[PDB]
Recover the amino acids of this structure.
C-alpha cells in the first residue's frame, strides 16, 4: 500500500494522463506528478532525490514536458 | 575558512543564485542571504549591521528581492 505522499503522486500521475488525454500513463506522468510546483524547498521538485542524485531539474522539466507533448491524445474517455 | 554563521550566509547566497537560476552570483544574493525574511529579529537582517548602520533597510529589502526577480533567469547548466 501507499503513504499519503506516494498515493498523491500515483493519483496525480493518473490525473495527468486524463488531463492530457493520454492513452497510457507513463513514467513521464509520474515524473510530472512529482513536479507539482517549481518550489525550491519542495522535495517533489528541488529537494528531490533526482536533483541531488543525478539529473538537474531545469533539464528534468524539459524532459518531462517534451514527452508529455510527444505522447498522443485520445478523446478523454480512453485515457490511461 | 568560514564559521557556521558565515559559511551559512555565503551558502545561502550561492543557493539563491542557483534556485532562481541566475547567470551570476553577486552582492544582491549575499544581501538577500542576509535579508532572509522581513523579520527585524533576524540577526542577519535588521538588528544586524543593516539597520544599525543607517542605510534605509526597506530599500535593501525591496531592491534586493526585486533584483532576485529582475536578474535574468537561466537553464540549470548556466544557473549561478
Amino acid at each position: 500500500q501507499f503513504t499519503e505522499r506516494a498515493l498523491t503522486i500515483l493519483t496525480l500521475a493518473q490525473k495527468l494522463a486524463s488531463d492530457h488525454q493520454h492513452p497510457q500513463l507513463q513514467p513521464i506522468h509520474i515524473l510530472a506528478a512529482f513536479i507539482e510546483t517549481p518550489e525550491d524547498g519542495s522535495v517533489p521538485y528541488l529537494q528531490n532525490l533526482i536533483e541531488k542524485g543525478r539529473y538537474d531539474y531545469d533539464l528534468f522539466k524539459k524532459v518531462v514536458n517534451r514527452n508529455l507533448v510527444r505522447i498522443p491524445q485520445q478523446q478523454p474517455a480512453p485515457a490511461e
